[PDB]
């Protein structure tokens, strides 16, 4: 356990700060006087500093017991070869660096085929968690995969891929026939809802926002992570206007890199 082993740090610092502060109380009163020209700038500062250091000792004493309340509670030769592997984890963090994703790219101008089973292995990696959502991969038309996604009791989404990249994505509710009369997945239709049609535009702006020229897996992973915030729809008020409805519209627009529900007017 480490909650007590790190909560002890404040108390073990506070007792030494008590020793140092009472030493200050002793020697500052033992320092005598430093007039610095006028006496009224000293003798009125005498009671000021005498209150200051004594009250510092007092507040240190006081904050000692609120930390004390929250806390609770071959022989040494082979011990040395144990923690070095644990500090090798820090050594892994030694060469990380904070440069991360950001680079200094210029223009990319000078002077392919992948199996659908690779797409299936891609979709199997992230479907394994988030059990409230489901993924149903299908290719009734060509090698391109379009997927049915159910979101608890809320949303039914068709997500069309092509050429291993993104093609389209249309979201509807939970009580509609997303299939056709023949039973195939619907391709060209409309969600028949003002809020859903409004947020499909946000989805189209988001798919053109996540731009990786080589790595579309993180593009679609960030897309579905963004979509995961939309299971909180009709349940969270807007962050700037307080109320849900802006002209009758609840907040939906999650901002880029900061996922919280907004409107177009609410930015």
């Amino acid at each position: 356990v480490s909650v007590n082993l790190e909560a002890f740090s404040q108390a073990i610092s506070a007792i030494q700060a008590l020793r140092s502060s009472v030493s200050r109380v002793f020697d500052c009163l033992k320092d005598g006087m430093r007039n610095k020209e006028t006496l009224e700038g000293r003798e009125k500062a005498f009671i000021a500093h005498f209150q200051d250091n004594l009250h510092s000792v007092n507040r240190d004493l006081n904050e000692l017991e609120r930390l004390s309340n929250l806390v609770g509670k071959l022989y040494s030769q082979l011990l040395q070869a144990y923690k070095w592997s644990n500090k090798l984890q820090y050594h892994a963090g030694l060469a990380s660096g904070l440069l991360n994703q950001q680079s200094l790219k210029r223009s990319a101008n000078q002077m392919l085929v992948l199996p659908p089973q690779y797409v299936d292995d891609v979709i199997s990696r992230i479907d394994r968690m988030f059990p409230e959502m489901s993924i149903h991969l299908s290719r009734p038309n060509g090698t391109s995969a379009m997927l049915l996604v159910t979101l608890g009791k809320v949303l039914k989404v068709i997500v069309v891929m092509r050429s291993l990249f993104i093609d389209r994505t249309i979201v509807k509710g939970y009580n509609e026939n997303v299939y056709t009369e023949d039973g195939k997945l619907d391709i060209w239709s409309k969600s028949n809802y003002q809020v859903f049609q409004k947020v499909t535009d946000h989805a189209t702006t988001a798919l053109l926002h996540y731009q990786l020229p080589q790595m579309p897996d993180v593009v679609v992973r960030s897309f579905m992570t963004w979509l995961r915030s939309y299971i909180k729809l009709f349940q969270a008020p807007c962050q700037r206007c307080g109320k849900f409805l802006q002209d009758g519209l609840p907040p939906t627009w999650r901002d880029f890199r900061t996922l919280e529900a907004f409107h177009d007017t609410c930015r």
Partner: protein
């Protein structure tokens, strides 16, 4: 055991005893048993009088604190502790249960049978103690110097060697001369000597630490 270091300008360091008390000679520290003889080990670089902070010019602390080959790459400081920590606790071995009989300033004589030995601090290198006790006797202390007083310096290996120490010495030294020519297992003369095979060895397991004999 404790160390005091007091830095100062122009490369000056004041070296106190640490384990002493500055102020009380009637009273000391409970957990830090006092550490004598420290200044002599300082003065070669150059009772309760080692409690002074000793001026050094930031340069003998180099050779003292540096891990150096043992005269394992163990420092003259930590070797000297090992010479000390054997010297403290061998006494605490000898006084209990065996026969204790010695008369010297700091040297200790264990008056048992089979060439009772007397051990003092070595003068050329104080970092190791030196024991004084036919020709196969002397190899035992060099093995004791290299291994039982090995620079890991843990206490319980002395428990075996103190309890380790007649004709049993004759075979084991033949095994000891053999082992020195090329551990946790000693030898005994159930037979007359130690041949190349079938010796009545005396081992000691780490997890057991019991009197082990194999024949």
């Amino acid at each position: 055991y404790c160390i005091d270091i007091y830095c100062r300008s122009r490369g000056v360091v004041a070296i106190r005893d640490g384990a002493y008390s500055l102020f009380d000679n009637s009273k000391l520290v409970e957990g830090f048993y006092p550490a004598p003889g420290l200044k002599t080990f300082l003065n070669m670089f150059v009772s309760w009088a080692a409690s002074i902070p000793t001026i050094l010019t930031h340069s003998a602390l180099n050779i003292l604190l540096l891990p150096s080959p043992t005269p394992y790459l163990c420092s003259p400081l930590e070797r000297f502790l090992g010479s000390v920590i054997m010297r403290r606790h061998l006494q605490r071995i000898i006084q209990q249960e065996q026969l204790i009989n010695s008369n010297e300033p700091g040297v200790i004589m264990f008056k048992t049978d089979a060439l009772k030995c007397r051990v003092a601090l070595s003068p050329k290198t104080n970092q190791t103690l030196q024991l004084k006790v036919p020709d196969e006797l002397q190899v035992l202390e060099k093995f004791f110097e290299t291994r039982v007083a090995g620079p890991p310096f843990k206490a319980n290996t002395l428990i075996a060697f103190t309890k380790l120490l007649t004709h049993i010495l004759r075979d084991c030294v033949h095994i000891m001369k053999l082992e020195l020519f090329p551990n946790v297992q000693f030898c005994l003369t159930i037979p007359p000597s130690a041949p190349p095979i079938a010796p009545p060895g005396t081992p000691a397991v780490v997890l057991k630490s019991k009197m082990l004999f194999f024949l």
